[PDB]
């Protein structure tokens, strides 16, 4: 019954993910539903790309979809066979009059980004791997990545009925209630053959003191 | 123990 940690500290310590503006209540809904199709399309199509987040840059028929991933080779493909396909797919799903010129950039220390960690947990769970060993291994790798404590809790069918047997782990100072904490959050819906598995990962990346405002 | 060492 607690608020999402990503939305609580949004706009006061973390910049907006889709920075743009347009005419009042006329077609901002159209852009809001169209650009989001890119955001969901990446996370659905390219599981192994390990994309962390994407930033949307729209102003008067121009779009710049910034991408952050650990393995850009899958997005690029072999001799640029996949970048043209992905950019033409984005064009077909966004329109024809807007220049796109996307970029693909590396992420520093990926193992401390909640999104890809949750994606790996979902992949491990859907791969019939026992939950405890995979979760412990991911915890160990993220802690060794050089971050603060982790809070992973997973619900769903834990290889059987009586789903209300969720498992949670905490291994360090994770002050969710502190706005000045710079806490990153993400969620993934692991889809096992028996039901739906929900994985939530909270990652602390050090305090954000003296940052003034959104970076 | 008699003596330490």
């Amino acid at each position: 019954q607690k608020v999402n940690s990503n939305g609580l500290r949004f706009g006061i310590n973390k910049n907006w993910i889709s920075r743009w503006t347009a005419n009042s209540h006329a077609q901002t809904a159209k852009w809001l539903i169209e650009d989001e199709k890119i955001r969901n399309l990446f996370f659905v199509n390219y599981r192994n790309a390990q994309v962390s987040n994407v930033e949307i840059e729209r102003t008067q028929a121009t779009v710049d979809v910034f991408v952050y991933a650990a393995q850009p080779a899958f997005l690029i493909g072999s001799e640029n066979k996949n970048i043209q396909k992905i950019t033409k797919q984005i064009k077909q799903i966004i329109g024809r009059t807007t220049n796109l010129d996307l970029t693909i950039n590396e992420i520093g220390s990926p193992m401390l980004s909640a999104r890809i960690i949750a994606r790996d947990l979902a992949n491990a769970i859907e791969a019939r791997v026992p939950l405890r060993t995979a979760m412990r291994q991911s915890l160990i790798k993220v802690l060794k990545a050089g971050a603060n404590g982790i809070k992973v809790l997973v619900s769903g069918r834990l290889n059987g009925a009586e789903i209300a047997r969720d498992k949670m782990y905490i291994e360090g100072n994770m002050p969710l209630s502190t706005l000045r904490a710079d806490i990153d959050y993400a969620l993934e819906k692991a889809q096992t053959t028996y039901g739906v598995i929900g994985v939530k990962v909270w990652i602390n990346r050090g305090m954000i003191y003296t940052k003034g405002l959104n970076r | 123990m008699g003596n330490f060492d």
Binding site: - | M1, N3, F4, D5
Partner: protein, 249 residues
């Protein structure tokens, strides 16, 4: 040779009829005083044994620890012994587990030293309120860990001035196999303490005397001079919150 029998003018006496009866070896049959007097020759023999053991321990260049917790006199006493001889010591209440567990306190003493140096290098960079808060915690830590700060491993030897009142410390020392020497007054249980020293500790004159002989015994092994031991007569005269009135109610 070592604290001849003449100097023990006040070295025997304890509250009436509170003695553990398994110590019938040392105490002679009861007399009018009803304070269980001790045999001084066996007392000197025990002092010899403690002397020659602590001397060899110090020659091994190990770590020995001191314990004093009664109200004022023994605390000031162990403080003086600590400032005179490079010895680990404890002056406040035993923290229930210093020796049996050590990883959970080594981190604490390391934090103490790190914050001490943090104060030493900080040129008022933070606010005055922040400066005051850290120094208060430093004072707190020195109040409990001011003694045991220059040690790395488990103390290989510890002394206790009252095993009955320090049952926690002697029990923890006996969980391990490390030796312990205690001023085993007539009310303690000798099955726990390794080297028995049947002396008087409630009275002020005797505890300081024997603590000083032990301190000089460990000091002479360090080449240092012996203030109260082996030194002969017209000496060993200690300032006395007067020593009289053995009975307690």
């Amino acid at each position: 040779s070592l604290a001849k029998l003449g100097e023990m003018r006040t070295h025997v006496g304890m509250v009436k009829r509170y003695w553990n009866p398994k110590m019938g070896f040392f105490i002679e049959p009861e007399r009018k005083h009803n304070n269980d007097h001790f045999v001084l020759e066996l007392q000197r023999q025990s002092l010899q044994t403690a002397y020659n053991y602590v001397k060899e321990v110090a020659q091994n260049n190990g770590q020995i620890l001191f314990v004093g917790t009664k109200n004022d006199y023994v605390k000031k006493l162990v403080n003086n012994i600590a400032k005179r001889v490079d010895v680990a010591f404890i002056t406040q209440r035993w923290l229930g587990g210093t020796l049996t567990n050590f990883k959970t306190l080594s981190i604490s003493i390391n934090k103490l030293n790190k914050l001490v140096e943090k104060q030493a290098e900080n040129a008022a960079d933070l606010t005055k309120k922040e400066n005051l808060m850290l120094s208060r915690e430093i004072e707190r830590l020195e109040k409990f860990f001011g003694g045991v700060k220059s040690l790395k491993r488990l103390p290989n030897l510890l002394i206790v001035d009252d095993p009955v009142y320090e049952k926690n410390a002697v029990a923890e020392a006996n969980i391990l196999r490390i030796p312990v020497v205690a001023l085993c007054n007539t009310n303690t249980n000798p099955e726990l303490v390794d080297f028995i020293i049947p002396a008087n500790n409630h009275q002020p004159q005797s505890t300081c005397l024997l603590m000083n002989l032990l301190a000089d015994a460990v000091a002479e092994a360090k080449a240092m001079p012996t203030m109260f031991a082996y030194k002969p007569d017209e000496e060993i005269q200690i300032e006395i919150p007067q020593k009289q009135e053995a009975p307690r109610q």
